[PDB]
């Protein structure tokens, strides 16, 4: 028998449930945030914060001399959980072990970074780009020339990201 039978407290409760005190108290809280500064950002001009460890566009780095870092070790293809990386290799007449077909299906890719952390030569990385939005499906099948173009475009920033977090791991 839940009881609140007291002369003074019955008046106090019967007023709160009659003049909407709870409703007014929950109503005046929104008005506090009405005049407060907003938390949104205009996306095209202002970008949201990121991290040096961000996982975005795949890129194929190359040595400062100009020779590509990829040595067709095929660790990235073997570790890739989504099985998105396909590699074909042969020995050039220079005798160097290099790739001829290194294509990533970015529609199968899950952006996990397993491929990036499996390279023994830091050949492939995940750059900070996250703005693919291609209009065609087969444009999303990167084919070792898109990889190298991304590597050339983002090299000055991929190198900074790698050297900043090289102390980790």
């Amino acid at each position: 028998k839940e009881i609140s039978k007291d002369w003074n407290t019955v008046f106090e409760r019967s007023i709160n449930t009659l003049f909407l005190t709870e409703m007014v108290r929950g109503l005046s809280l929104t008005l506090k945030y009405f005049f407060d500064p907003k938390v949104t950002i205009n996306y095209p001009f202002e970008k949201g914060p990121l991290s040096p460890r961000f996982r975005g566009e795949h890129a194929l780095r190359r040595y400062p001399t100009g020779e590509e870092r990829c040595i067709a070790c095929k660790l990235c293809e073997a570790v890739c959980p989504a099985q998105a990386i396909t590699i074909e290799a042969e020995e050039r007449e220079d005798g160097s072990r290099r790739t001829t077909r290194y294509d990533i299906d970015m529609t199968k890719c899950i952006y996990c970074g397993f491929c990036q952390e499996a390279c023994p030569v830091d050949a492939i990385v995940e750059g900070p780009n996250f703005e693919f939005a291609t209009e065609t499906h087969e444009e999303l099948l990167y084919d070792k020339e898109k990889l190298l173009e991304n590597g050339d475009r983002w090299e000055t920033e991929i190198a900074e990201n790698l050297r900043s977090e090289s102390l980790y791991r």
Partner: protein
């Protein structure tokens, strides 16, 4: 405009405002063009600065 931080070879200019304790309106871009600007014109050097990845301005990142 509290501060203007550098420019770009494409013409888009980069600004910066410093808050006190809460995030918001820290750094943004004024794109040079107007034909919908493709939302992607920041180069690699200035891409890290804009997204708070690195504290380097981007002109310093070129050197």
């Amino acid at each position: 405009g509290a501060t203007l931080v550098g420019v770009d070879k494409f013409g888009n200019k980069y600004y910066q405002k410093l808050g006190d304790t809460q995030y918001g309106r820290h750094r943004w871009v004024e794109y040079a063009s107007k034909d919908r600007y493709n939302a992607s014109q920041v180069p690699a050097e200035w891409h890290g600065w804009l997204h708070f990845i690195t504290d380097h301005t981007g002109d310093e990142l070129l050197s």
